From a paper:
[name] (PYK) is the last enzyme in this pathway that catalyzes the production of pyruvate from phosphoenolpyruvate (PEP) and plays a crucial role in controlling carbon flux; however, while S. pneumoniae PYK (SpPYK) is indispensable for growth, surprisingly little is known about its functional properties. The overall structure of SpPYK, which consists of four protomers with three domains, shares the structural organization of archetypal PYKs. PYKs require divalent cations for activity, and they are either K+-dependent or K+-independent depending on the active site residue being a Glu or Lys, respectively. This residue is Glu93 in SpPYK, and we found that both Mg2+ and K+ are necessary for the proper function of SpPYK. In contrast, only a modest activation effect was observed upon G6P addition, and the kinetic profile remained sigmoidal. These results demonstrate that FBP is the primary allosteric activator of SpPYK.
Author numbering:
A (entry chain D): 1 to 21, 34 to 94, 106 to 117, 136 to 501
B (entry chain B): 1 to 25, 34 to 94, 108 to 118, 141 to 162, 171 to 177, 183 to 501
C (entry chain A): 1 to 96, 131 to 161, 170 to 177, 185 to 500
D (entry chain C): 1 to 17, 32 to 96, 109 to 122, 130 to 176, 185 to 501
Write the structure that this text describes.
Amino acid sequence: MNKRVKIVATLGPAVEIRGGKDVEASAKNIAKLIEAGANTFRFNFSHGDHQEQGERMATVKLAEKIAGKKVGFLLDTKGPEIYSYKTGEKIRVAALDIYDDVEVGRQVLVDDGKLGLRVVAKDDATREFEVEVENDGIIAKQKGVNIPNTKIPFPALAERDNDDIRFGLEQGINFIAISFVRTAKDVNEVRAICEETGNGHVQLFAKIENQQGIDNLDEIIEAADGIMIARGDMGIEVPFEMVPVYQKMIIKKVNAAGKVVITATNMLETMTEKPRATRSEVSDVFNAVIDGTDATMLSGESANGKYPLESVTTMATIDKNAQALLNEYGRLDSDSFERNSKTEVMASAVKDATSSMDIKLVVTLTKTGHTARLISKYRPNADILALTFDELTERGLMLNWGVIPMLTDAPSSTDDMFEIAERKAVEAGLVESGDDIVIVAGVPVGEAVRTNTMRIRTVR
Amino acid sequence: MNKRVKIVATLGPAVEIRGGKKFGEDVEASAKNIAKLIEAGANTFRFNFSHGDHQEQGERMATVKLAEKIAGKKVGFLLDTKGPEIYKTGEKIRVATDDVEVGRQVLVDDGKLGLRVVAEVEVENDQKGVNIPNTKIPFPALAERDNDDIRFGLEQGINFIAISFVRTAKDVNEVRAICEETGNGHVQLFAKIENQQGIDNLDEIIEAADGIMIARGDMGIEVPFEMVPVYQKMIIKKVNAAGKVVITATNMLETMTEKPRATRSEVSDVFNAVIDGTDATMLSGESANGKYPLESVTTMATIDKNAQALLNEYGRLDSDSFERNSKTEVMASAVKDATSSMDIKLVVTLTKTGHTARLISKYRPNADILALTFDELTERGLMLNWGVIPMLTDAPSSTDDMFEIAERKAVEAGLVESGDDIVIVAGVPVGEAVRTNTMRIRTVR
Amino acid sequence: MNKRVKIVATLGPAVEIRGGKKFGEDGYWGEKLDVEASAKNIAKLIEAGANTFRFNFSHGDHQEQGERMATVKLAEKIAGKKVGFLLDTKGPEIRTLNVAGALDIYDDVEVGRQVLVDDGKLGLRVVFEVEVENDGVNIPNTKIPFPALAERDNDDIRFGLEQGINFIAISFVRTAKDVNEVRAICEETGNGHVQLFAKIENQQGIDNLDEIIEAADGIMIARGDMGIEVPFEMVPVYQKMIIKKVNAAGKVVITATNMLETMTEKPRATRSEVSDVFNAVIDGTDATMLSGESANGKYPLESVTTMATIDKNAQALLNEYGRLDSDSFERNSKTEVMASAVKDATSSMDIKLVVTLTKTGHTARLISKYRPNADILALTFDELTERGLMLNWGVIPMLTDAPSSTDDMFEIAERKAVEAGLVESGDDIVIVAGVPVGEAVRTNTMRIRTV
Amino acid sequence: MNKRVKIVATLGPAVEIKLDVEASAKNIAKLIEAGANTFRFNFSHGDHQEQGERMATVKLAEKIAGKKVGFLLDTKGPEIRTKTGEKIRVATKQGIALNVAGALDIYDDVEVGRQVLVDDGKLGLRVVAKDDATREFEVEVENGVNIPNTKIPFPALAERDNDDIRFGLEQGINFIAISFVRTAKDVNEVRAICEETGNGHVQLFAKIENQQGIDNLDEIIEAADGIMIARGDMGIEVPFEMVPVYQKMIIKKVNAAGKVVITATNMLETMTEKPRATRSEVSDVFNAVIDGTDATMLSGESANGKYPLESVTTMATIDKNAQALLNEYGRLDSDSFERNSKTEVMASAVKDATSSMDIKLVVTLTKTGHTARLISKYRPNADILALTFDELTERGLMLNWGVIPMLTDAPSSTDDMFEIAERKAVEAGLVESGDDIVIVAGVPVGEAVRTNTMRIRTVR
Ligand SMILES: O=P(O)(O)OC[C@H]1O[C@](O)(COP(=O)(O)O)[C@@H](O)[C@@H]1O
Ligand SMILES: O=P(O)(O)OC[C@H]1O[C@](O)(COP(=O)(O)O)[C@@H](O)[C@@H]1O
Ligand SMILES: O=P(O)(O)OC[C@H]1O[C@](O)(COP(=O)(O)O)[C@@H](O)[C@@H]1O
Ligand SMILES: O=P(O)(O)OC[C@H]1O[C@](O)(COP(=O)(O)O)[C@@H](O)[C@@H]1O
């Protein structure tokens, strides 16, 4: 019984066992988050340096060979960043001069948006904001400041970020989560690097963190390969009771576009410290599966928590069960999609087959992962083994709902792709004799040009 | 545009030209006539054995075999068995023989004169056929008058038998005993429902039979005349659910027996038979013995063709409720999906027995269904399934590309042209595949 | 079991006794109309379920029409039930050519048009030099400038309003203008209460269907001529699309022509005629019509009774097979939302009767738009609005005293229902009214009450 | 814009100022202004005396806030109070060991292969052998005491339970949540106390904490007046990954029954020691409102947190956003209910009017509060003003979805309840001139059994 929601697990020091408190030891430890249900590790280049990142990547390539399973490599960029008080205390506040881009009536928030300073006056002397306090609270050395609803001219791509992804593209990554995507352009420029440097295979998840990115969700979905729902920044930058509705609506739109969405931040946050999750958190990751998410993500829980292995297995088991109730309660609705291509109508016909019968497995023989993404779109009640013929495409499919990618030789004009499909499934022990599978391919290899053939086969 | 609903035309004198003189005033003359019913959209000729001798039926079936040669199209051959058979308000009268309750009605001449038995009968309103509604009278499940006729038919070469006055599975099974004992298992059996006992046992009759003939004449006398609309909707639904074929019969373009144009109730009634889900519509008297036989076929074909353009909006069958009971079904379902997802011009099934062509027809895709079959008897046996166009082809070799043969037979048929998308289903590889197991979406070159 | 689908029975010589002799007995014409004998012939059609009589002003002079309407006013008193009076206009016409208003059609019949003869059985193709194509006169797809209202129709409608009619059925409606011109006669002469049914009978009438329904009080599908003027195999699609639309408009539809035609000669209808009446009801029609079958046929009483039982049986299956859908309606007024809530109530429990205290019949029309699964008793306060309700689906009109501001209309409602013989005790009814009387502007209260 | 989803706030030291009261009265007072609808006194963290004066404190809180609220008492209910491989032992013996509630021999009920979870389902002791002769247990360590999936005959009515139920009924309460309900009888011998005392008007909420209570859900719902989903204990008694399944299915069965349902546990949990909620917490609160819950519960977040007023104002914000997405995402579907009574069917028409037109308010003239409970079940798109004529059913409606309980003098047989209906709502500040409202009542008053008539009126 396989887990179909993918897990994106952030890495950090928690798994890195430093001289007993060291590669092959902590590679044998992250190879355990792989066996536990992690499909992609996140490297947040906001909390490390290239020397620390470049190392923690060669050590995961070690764990893949320990565990036998491969995983995806995702770089998260850093992107635009910016004494206890009591109410009414009118004060003020001081590399871009954001002076004329924040206006009166805005709100300046410090630390997880925990202290509000409404800007009441435009002091123009020392270029300062005459603000005042709305609630008692702190300002600590170096904590996040968000000025919501403002459109501060941050670069489409900050070169701090430019250098970061360029280093990732040369170690060997598969995805880039772009932080603070406000327009399609913030995506296009990271795209222009992936093609310039010869890495068209990389997939871009835009992170939606503020109102600029929600009011542009369409044109961003169009330009990106996925959406990461960075709820943290979004839950400061827009009303905190609107991220449940914005999350339901993002998962639906992104599924409609045939792309991947990842639901992020705070999913098992207690389990950073304590060894068990609140039932508010088991509710959350469960509901993300019913809203249609491709993948659930661990941030702090996996990177710098006491229980890194525990929060993967936890998510894994919640995800595993919540998949069992998508028939009854599922919110995605494939029956409303326009089938906009021959491969997509085929993907529909496969969903129909799994609804009509007990299909154990769908197999697709796919060069670029297109029919695998499209089958995944329709969320069949069966797992999708995607036989592809190049590791980059294989790794590129590891966040798609239900997809199990697997390398095999590109087939010649003279070999039953249908026996190959049965053979590779059984080798993987995903089907036992008498199981029914749905195999799709473009046949005959040579004249096919797209997936064009659906076959129902019972395993010998 | 191809007529999906099939027409069963009852044969008789109205087209048979005897010594140059028409009916009511020579097989080559009558063959050029029958050739015109065929191009007009007759898919199957009916031979009602209830009115005719064995000399007559033999000679007509002669005439249509020539008609196919003239017409360049084949049709099916249907034998209608005859089977079981038999004053003013207040006159008191008796009649002479255990199955008739004192309370039953007797009706002489086509259910118009009413004898309500009281011990002895009494008239109720102001060698004839008699009905006794709501009685389980033990007519032989297999009569002998019929037993001889059926054997006489299978002799000549027939594809269907319509069993008059079915009321239990026994009445069909014993006619199916005769077909697989003469080595014509290939013959398909329509169970005419005509009375309450038929309707009460309709499920077991559907199961035994290959299809129902909704026999509305007798059925109008035997059940209350205002429930046959209700029965017609519920029989078409159930037969369809059982992957079988339902003919809707008698009185359809009635006044076209005498006048050149149909009443607006008649047009409405053919029209609604399609919307309810009929596989076929039937002309009885209208084409057997009537002044405008070809105009009756042409009118029904024109009506049938329109009503199918509205099956999506108005249509009553609903394939989403069906349970796919075999791997061939879930692929029939998956074909219907394909035709819903994009503009598909034709379904092509390569089919040894026509099983696959029937499950596809069952699902009623929005596309015609070209059936590529390898013997004349499977071919003719598919001519009453909704939307199936039977086309004889050479059995594909172990090297032939059957998706190519599907395209070439369809372009030969003139059912497709360069640009059209088609769905093609097959058993691959040929011979070793136990059932249709492959679906292809092919663009026509 | 009250028949909720109303019937329109055309009257004619078939029910009329002329000196002991029935219609067709040798020497029946130029005799003495036995009016009291003819009145209890007619009176039995009324009991058998005829809800309104059609006087077809194409096959009668003004005196014979005037006399028959008299006989029907008697028949009511025998039957102890009242019916509506319907005038069917002659309309624009051409016959073998004689044209109405002696018009010259020559400058607007283009070439490539058809010319049909006798019930559309023989075709003539304009090349008028015209060729025969196969072995009354219609000219499909033309816009012959027939006056929006001729004069013979003007005089027919006026004679009829004088006698006292409740409905007019306007022949060959091509646009709203044909309707608004008869609506002006009706208002000009005091008869603003009269209701107009447009007969859609041709391509321009169908092309203009929306604006016509907007002008009229409802539609008479006259499938006869419609099937000569448009491709015969469309009449079903048009029947279904007109019923759905006239219902979305909360107006009345009548399905008509050849419905039980075999019964005009032989005494039992064919299977396709029983089919046709059944499907009309399942389609959504308020009303089924008889023409020849009841006017000059050998079994007018039987054809009425047959239509009634098909209609009574068909209605019991509207819940399954029924084509109309009151769920997609937009409720455009507070009375409609009350109509909606009545219909919801008759769906949650068994309701044997809905009652409405209606001054104008509005609430009655809006309730019957929603096709609740009960009967509708309309208690109205004059014979004009009572009779005017008589072709609305499921509506039983009954005249009662206008309630006073010191009256329980809910007890009035129960008392009248028990008087009519529709309820017994323990039955559940929905009652609807504007309370308090003389202060409520509109039907604003519903109540569920045990008899 | 009023709030329809009710809040149950648990009171504790956190709002109270020796214990003063007039100072504690004006903390509790703005909890009511925030949205707190019913106060919960968990009678397992305090004696009869202290919890007595807190109920005295809130009723003057009521009269400074200018709104009345409800009184819920949670029984202590049944209880058992007391690294890998360690083969320890634990004893069934009493007064030696387990502090079984009211003392019991729990031996011949806990079979081998069960599981003894000490310290909040923290530690796991897999029972491996039974010492039939001694009667103790032989366990083996795996990774308060809960023993899942066993029918321990816990005191169906302990006198410790019997004691505090009677002190509440004397002090003026409204609801009793009954802990660890496992059969119908656990509500009967507490309802038999209420009818006894002359307090049949009080309503009982079965707290479902264990598996027996989930196997017996139907007959308990039949016997109780509501369910409190105690996701605290439930997460330990059943597999933690199914409490979101069981929560969704509980709320459905409870709302089909026409009874109240409360989502409790861990809901705004971080809002105890931190000032803003996790994004998994807000999604949790949000989802239970889409699930169709009548009320949402704060425990320690208002009983002993740093931010009790803020926990209620935030929960009040999430409830009023989720309520506005009920016509789109709502899991409850009233179109499937059978309409059993003539009051159900009148409630069904009120629903109809709120979907046929803009209905600002539905008003019920009710005495039992029945009609207001049938209307609430069908969840009309509008608030419910329930007029009833005594503070002893006025209080009991305060946990029903959407209903604003308001008291006035019972009407005379010579009046139009409708006029007084329009008159309360205008005084109540819920409607202005032109508002369309739906009034339901039984007429004529003094000779009419059930709720009888429905009227549509536009506010004078
Ligand atoms: O059916 P569509 O959307 O036109 O996709 C067809 C395209 O996808 C491809 O078939 C790639 O498909 P796979 O990567 O799934 O094998 C291309 O050859 C082809 O051009
Ligand atoms: O898939 P099902 O319904 O079990 O039926 C399969 C059977 O019908 C057949 O497929 C025949 O099908 P066709 O005649 O339509 O090719 C047999 O080969 C097989 O025994
Ligand atoms: O609710 P609506 O459609 O605006 O109807 C309002 C009209 O209905 C009427 O009550 C007519 O109603 P009744 O004839 O049914 O009594 C008028 O007085 C009123 O102006
Ligand atoms: O639910 P039912 O069967 O209509 O019964 C209605 C019940 O509610 C009551 O009408 C109470 O109604 P209220 O809501 O006005 O208090 C009782 O008279 C009656 O027993």
